Ligand binder design. Structure first.
Ligand SMILES: O=C(O)CNC(=O)c1cccc(O)c1
Length: 167
């Protein structure tokens, strides 16, 4: 038994809710929140900007030190950093950005990072401003992630379509 409430069960291990992931992280304070990162950890908008804003920019300060030491992530890659006031840890995962020409086949590699963590609060990777079809992203999630994932979908209209079209 964990602290997540009001999620619709899709599979053995995948759960979904219409929720602001920032508000969800503040309420639950999960072990791991997933950020929809880019390779530079420049948290300007969507999930990364909202979580970064909720940390009062401490996520961006930490991220800049990480990049100055280690260089950019890979598309499909991740790093673990502090969760600040939102979570124990933030798993920054880079899904492919369709609006930048990145290989959508990298979405499965991106989701494989979640398997290193027993439980996560996460967005649908490569959805929103990353330009992928959220229906596709949910299918890859269900077919790739084996650990327990709690998906927060910001848009109520998209949430209802994700549930009602789920195979
Ligand atoms: O849910 C998604 O797939 C995309 N969500 C966002 O971009 C987002 C989530 C929470 C706050 C916010 O300003 C944007």
């Amino acid at each position: 038994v964990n602290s997540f409430s009001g999620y619709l069960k899709l599979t053995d291990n995948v759960y979904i809710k219409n929720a602001d992931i920032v508000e969800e992280a503040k309420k639950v304070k999960p072990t791991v929140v997933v950020n929809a990162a880019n390779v530079y950890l420049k948290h300007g908008g969507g999930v990364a900007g909202a979580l970064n804003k909720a940390t009062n920019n401490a996520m961006q300060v930490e991220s800049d030190d990480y990049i100055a030491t280690n260089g950019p992530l890979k598309v499909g890659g991740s790093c673990v950093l502090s969760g600040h006031n939102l979570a124990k840890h933030c798993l920054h995962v880079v899904g492919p950005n369709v609006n930048k020409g990145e290989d959508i086949q990298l979405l499965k590699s991106a989701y494989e990072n979640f398997n290193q963590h027993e439980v996560l609060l996460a967005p649908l990777l490569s959805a929103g401003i990353f330009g992928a079809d959220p229906i596709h992203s949910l299918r890859v999630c269900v077919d790739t992630v084996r650990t327990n994932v709690y998906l927060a979908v910001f848009d109520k209209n998209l949430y209802d379509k994700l549930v009602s079209s789920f195979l």
